[PDB]
Write a protein that binds this ligand. Structure first.
Ligand code: K
Ligand code: K
Ligand code: K
Ligand code: K
Ligand code: K
Ligand code: K
Ligand code: MG
Ligand code: MG
Ligand code: MG
Ligand code: MG
Ligand code: MG
Ligand code: MG
Ligand code: MG
Ligand code: MG
Ligand code: MG
Ligand code: MG
Ligand code: MG
Ligand code: MG
Ligand code: MG
Ligand code: MG
Ligand code: MG
Ligand code: MG
Ligand code: MG
Ligand code: MG
Ligand code: MG
Ligand code: MG
Ligand code: MG
Ligand code: MG
Ligand code: MG
Ligand code: MG
Ligand code: MG
Ligand code: MG
Ligand code: MG
Ligand code: MG
Ligand code: MG
Ligand code: MG
Ligand code: MG
Ligand code: MG
Ligand code: MG
Ligand code: MG
Ligand code: MG
Ligand code: MG
Ligand code: MG
Ligand code: MG
Ligand code: MG
Ligand code: MG
Ligand code: MG
Ligand code: MG
Lengths: 164, 202, 85, 56
RNA sequence: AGUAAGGUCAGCUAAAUAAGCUAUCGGGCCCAUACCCCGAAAAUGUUGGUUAUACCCUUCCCGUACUACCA
RNA sequence: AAUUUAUUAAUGCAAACAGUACCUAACAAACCCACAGGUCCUAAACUACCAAACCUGCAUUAAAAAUUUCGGUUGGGGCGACCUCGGAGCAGAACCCAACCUCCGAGCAGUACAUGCUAAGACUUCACCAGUCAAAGCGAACUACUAUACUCAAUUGAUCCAAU
RNA sequence: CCUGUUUACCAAAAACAUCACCUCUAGCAUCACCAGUAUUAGAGGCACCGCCUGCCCAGUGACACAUGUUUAACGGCCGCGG
RNA sequence: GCUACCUAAGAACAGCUAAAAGAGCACACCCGUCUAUGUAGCAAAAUAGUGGGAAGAUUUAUAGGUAGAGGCGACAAACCUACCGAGCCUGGUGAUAGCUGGUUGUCCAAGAUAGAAUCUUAGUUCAACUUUAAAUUUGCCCACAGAACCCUCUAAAUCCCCUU
């Protein structure tokens, strides 16, 4: 277990996060941790940002997954590419891996105009697809999820219920 | 504090008798030096408004170095004694009953200080016709300034904006402090494009 | 002032060892005396004052055998005189 | 002292009684499986080598 | 007088499939010699014992080495 | 030489103490837009550096020291050799018996896996410690196996303590 | 080398010191060095002068760090056969 | 208050040569080369003669400084109050000594002893021997019979052993 790799995985787990909006109506993002968790609200918010930041209705939602693709044993696992077609493919897709191996993957999920239920179903298939490399229960495989559109910032999805 | 114990057992002395100490009882082994223990925070009640600690009447756990050197000597905070705790608890109860707080929570004061000295770049794209509404304006606070602003708290100048220029935005925090921030409507640029053009070159 | 065994082994030499507290210079304000004193204290003294919620409480509450300082007892007499009078 | 040909090993009963005995075997041969009398069960049972004790 | 240690191609060293180098022999090169080139030959001090042998032990022999002190 | 760093110095960490920095690499293939630039094919997430010495604690490397010892046999001591165990001669026939006396060896190996348990009576290296032989009995083996305390001469090390 | 010094009470010397030569360390102030400042100060070797002081950094120590450096530091400065 | 070195402030050094002198000859003065005497001496280091130095790194009076895990030293392991491989006094201290010496009235009796271990062979502990008391029963001396082959001395003898 390399010190640099293990510390980064320890640090990302230690990033604070909170549920719901704070009491203050106007507050800085620095003063409070992340708040937005629900995937259904995330898809609606990504469409909302399309209206506010005037752009094309159809956007590629390149989900970024901070997957713990290591620390199964003292010997870390190696990157691969498991290709599984999504139930609602956008108009088999390879699961790319980071060049720097910083345990974050950039994979397109669905177009922005696609319904949230279809997008959520596509997300669930990816969760099982990425974990297929190391389906062992000895070590956690998913740490954080950031669903971002082409012209929007990611949101810390509550992927913990969707892990099994 | 250095804590040590004797290597050799001291024979019992009994009731009302001092123990008999041989020269071998001077042998000590180090148990623990308290200076190496993890540091604990100090519980204090603030009397004034601090930049980051908080505001008057708030139970704040701060580092012992900060409290003993800055807050206590300068009167910014007092000990969280039961007497002091009850006093401030009654103070806030009366303030709630009298509706005279106007002091903002710990986060709210920092937001106001940031909002006093800040400028928002509302990047609007030239191709698609755009109308500025408080929902759109609050979006740019989250992106550019990194501020989460409720849409209802924003008060636009009520004049529709379709051209690039300078305007003003009134931001209200907790319904108590109203901050008028400058507004700069500039043509939108992609952050990956904008950072390359300006930050990388200069 | 005590003795130690080298490498914490009773079969090794018995050496002389002296443990000294880490002394710090701090300034304390006394509400009763309305004066600030520059007193050499340790980290333990700061904790006792913090637990007593002030220097004035610490001086009055701490018994003579625990203060272990002639200056501390002199401070106690000054505070007690003002309260008495 | 430099010579080393046999080792001392512990044979543990396969009956689960915990009875053990030490025997000598060549270092270069495989682990021993011997039929030895076990007092707890009062009959001969298989014994399997588990750990080496020392070098003889 | 004691004790250590060494004994290997002609020579000198390395390894114990006992090899390399020089020397040695034969051929080539050159009017000739040498250098050079090709090829060949050439040894475990000795005694006995070490499964059996060799590097080991040991018998004997040559040479080598250190010590032989204090009153 | 063994033991030690108490002392001194250097270094490292902790303690104590100031705070200060603020993380950027597009590029339109198509389209839009008078520009400037946009849409589509990612615009995420997420920080960093230095607090001076002094003092104290814990380590490390040195310096300079401290404490203590320097075995025995021996045709005086030193040097050489020797120090434990077994066989043979001296010691011819019960036992025993020395020499820096004469000779040869040992610090294992091999085969079993009941070299399991238990118990009369004995031997004993001139003490002790230690060592040795054992009928019966229990349990096995066995009605082929000079089978029942392996072959073998020595083939080895007490207590404390440590490992489990 | 010289004058000198030493075991008062068995050794006065060839021993020690010494001018000279050389190596090492130090960029500096209010109690030594020094009320001084590298042509200085301290730690050492050797011993005026004259001719000279050769070879060696593998080991030891010191120094310096990327290899390394240093003997006027400790020390060393070969065989066999024809 | 001796001596080693140092500090403050003093003193002494005729005559001759050269006149420059850690220069020469040579008093005072300092030192102590050689010989004799002395050896409980005049003297716990001297006397007599002969010698080294004697304007210099000289000699010397006075007061002061450095103290024993030290001082000081032109290193002689010098010198630090006559005896310094590290002073002296007191205390711990009645240090310890397997080593040496000594160990006090009368009388009688028994009484000479294989070994083993040991940083042990200058000693101890256990055996053996010796002594005292006690218990109860054989002890000693010994008739046959009996106790090994291998091997050169076919030994003197021993062990066992009733009787007596
Ligand atoms: K003799
Ligand atoms: K002389
Ligand atoms: K070197
Ligand atoms: K006299
Ligand atoms: K004096
Ligand atoms: K003795
Ligand atoms: Mg009692
Ligand atoms: Mg007592
Ligand atoms: Mg010490
Ligand atoms: Mg320190
Ligand atoms: Mg001691
Ligand atoms: Mg010894
Ligand atoms: Mg000796
Ligand atoms: Mg001897
Ligand atoms: Mg002899
Ligand atoms: Mg010897
Ligand atoms: Mg015999
Ligand atoms: Mg006998
Ligand atoms: Mg016996
Ligand atoms: Mg039987
Ligand atoms: Mg002179
Ligand atoms: Mg003399
Ligand atoms: Mg003299
Ligand atoms: Mg003399
Ligand atoms: Mg000399
Ligand atoms: Mg100089
Ligand atoms: Mg010399
Ligand atoms: Mg010269
Ligand atoms: Mg030279
Ligand atoms: Mg070198
Ligand atoms: Mg002077
Ligand atoms: Mg004159
Ligand atoms: Mg003169
Ligand atoms: Mg005089
Ligand atoms: Mg003199
Ligand atoms: Mg003269
Ligand atoms: Mg004194
Ligand atoms: Mg002198
Ligand atoms: Mg000398
Ligand atoms: Mg000498
Ligand atoms: Mg004296
Ligand atoms: Mg005595
Ligand atoms: Mg003794
Ligand atoms: Mg008699
Ligand atoms: Mg012994
Ligand atoms: Mg004896
Ligand atoms: Mg008899
Ligand atoms: Mg009889």
């Amino acid at each position: 277990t390399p010190d640099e790799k293990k510390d980064e995985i320890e640090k990302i787990k230690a990033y604070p996060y909170m549920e719901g909006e704070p009491e203050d109506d106007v507050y800085l993002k620095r003063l409070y941790p992340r708040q937005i968790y629900e995937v259904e609200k995330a898809v609606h918010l990504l469409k909302k940002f399309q209206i506010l930041d005037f752009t094309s209705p159809k956007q590629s939602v390149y989900l970024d997954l901070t997957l713990d693709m290591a620390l199964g044993k003292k010997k870390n696992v190696e990157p691969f590419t498991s290709v599984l077609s999504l139930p609602y493919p956008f108009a088999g897709h390879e699961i790319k891996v980071d060049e720097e191996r910083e345990n974050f993957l950039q994979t397109k999920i669905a177009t922005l105009d696609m319904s949230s239920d279809q997008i959520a179903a596509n997300l669930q298939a990816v969760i099982n697809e990425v974990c297929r490399h190391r389906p062992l229960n000895l070590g956690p495989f998913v740490v954080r999820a950031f669903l971002r559109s082409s012209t929007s910032e990611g949101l810390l999805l509550k992927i913990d219920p969707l892990l099994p | 504090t250095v804590i040590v114990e004797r290597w050799w057992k001291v024979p019992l002395a009994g009731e009302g008798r001092k123990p008999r100490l041989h020269r071998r009882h001077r042998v000590y082994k180090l148990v623990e030096d308290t200076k190496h223990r993890p540091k604990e925070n100090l519980e204090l009640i603030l009397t004034q408004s601090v930049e980051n600690v908080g505001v008057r009447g708030d139970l704040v756990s701060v580092k012992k170095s900060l409290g003993r050197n800055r807050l206590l000597p300068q009167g910014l905070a007092v000990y969280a004694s039961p007497e002091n705790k009850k006093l401030f608890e009654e103070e806030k109860l009366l303030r709630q009953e009298g509706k005279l707080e106007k002091i903002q929570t710990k986060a709210g004061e920092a937001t106001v200080k940031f909002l006093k000295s800040c400028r928002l770049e509302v990047g609007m794209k030239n191709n698609v016709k755009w109308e500025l509404n408080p929902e759109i304006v609050a979006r740019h606070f989250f992106k550019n300034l990194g501020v989460v602003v409720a849409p209802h708290t924003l008060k636009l100048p009520e004049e529709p904006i379709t051209r690039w220029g300078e305007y003003w935005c009134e931001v209200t925090v907790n319904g108590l402090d109203t901050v008028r921030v400058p507004m700069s409507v500039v043509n939108f640029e992609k952050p990956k494009t904008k950072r390359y053009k300006y930050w990388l070159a200069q | 002032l005590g003795q130690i065994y080298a490498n914490n082994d009773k079969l090794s030499k018995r050496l002389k060892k002296v443990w000294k507290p880490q002394l710090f210079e701090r300034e304390f304000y006394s509400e009763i005396l309305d004066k600030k004193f520059t007193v050499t204290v340790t980290m333990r003294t700061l904790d006792l004052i913090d637990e007593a919620y002030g220097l004035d409480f610490y001086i009055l509450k701490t018994p003579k055998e625990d203060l272990c300082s002639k200056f501390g007892m002199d401070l106690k007499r000054g505070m007690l005189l003002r309260l008495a009078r | 002292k430099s010579k080393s040909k046999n080792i001392l090993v512990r044979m543990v009963s396969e009956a689960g009684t915990g009875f053990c005995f030490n025997t000598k075997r060549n270092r270069l041969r495989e682990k021993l499986t011997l039929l030895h009398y076990d007092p707890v069960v009062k009959q001969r049972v298989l014994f399997v080598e588990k750990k080496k004790i020392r070098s003889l």
